[PDB]
Every structure is written in C-alpha cells, then in structure tokens.
C-alpha cells in the first residue's frame, strides 16, 4: 500500500514495507491546539495504532487514504 507520510517536507507518499498494509493518521492536541489545531502524524502500519484516551487515530487500507486534513484522499 502507498501512504501519505509526515516524515517529509512537503508531505509526500511512500510505499509501505511488506506486511504493512494500512495507512494511518494520528492527531492530538499540544499547547498550540487552540490556534493551530491538532498535531498531525501520517504513516504506515501493519496493525492500527492502539486507541489512546487523548489521541485520535484513523487507519485505512487504500492508497493515500490518510491525507493531511487540508488535502483530499486518493
């Protein structure tokens, strides 16, 4: 699968390692949440990152299904 990644600047797409067939988007608040919104992390995954109390997680299985909130999927 191919996923968006926040490891690069600008955000780009990477082909995930074999066995990692999901894309993920993780978002959470830091000190700047009120003005900048939540922190955004995008990457690859074999297993969806566990759901943490004060964290939002989205995991999907189609190419580039995990875009930055400011971008459309695909």
């Amino acid at each position: 699968i191919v996923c968006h990644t926040t490891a690069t600047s600008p955000i780009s797409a990477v082909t995930c390692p074999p066995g990692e067939n999901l894309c993920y988007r993780k978002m959470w608040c830091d000190v700047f949440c009120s003005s900048r919104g939540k922190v955004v992390e995008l990457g690859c995954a074999a297993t969806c990152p566990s759901k943490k109390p004060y964290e939002e997680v989205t995991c999907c299985s189609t190419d580039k299904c995990n875009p930055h909130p400011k971008q459309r999927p695909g």
Partner: peptide, 13 residues
Amino acid sequence: WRYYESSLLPYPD
C-alpha cells in the same frame, strides 16, 4: 518539523 491540521506547511521542532 511538526505538522498541524491548520496548514500543509510544517512548523519548527
């Protein structure tokens, strides 16, 4: 760098 939902441009740190 770190990204926030408010911009496609990354912030320092």
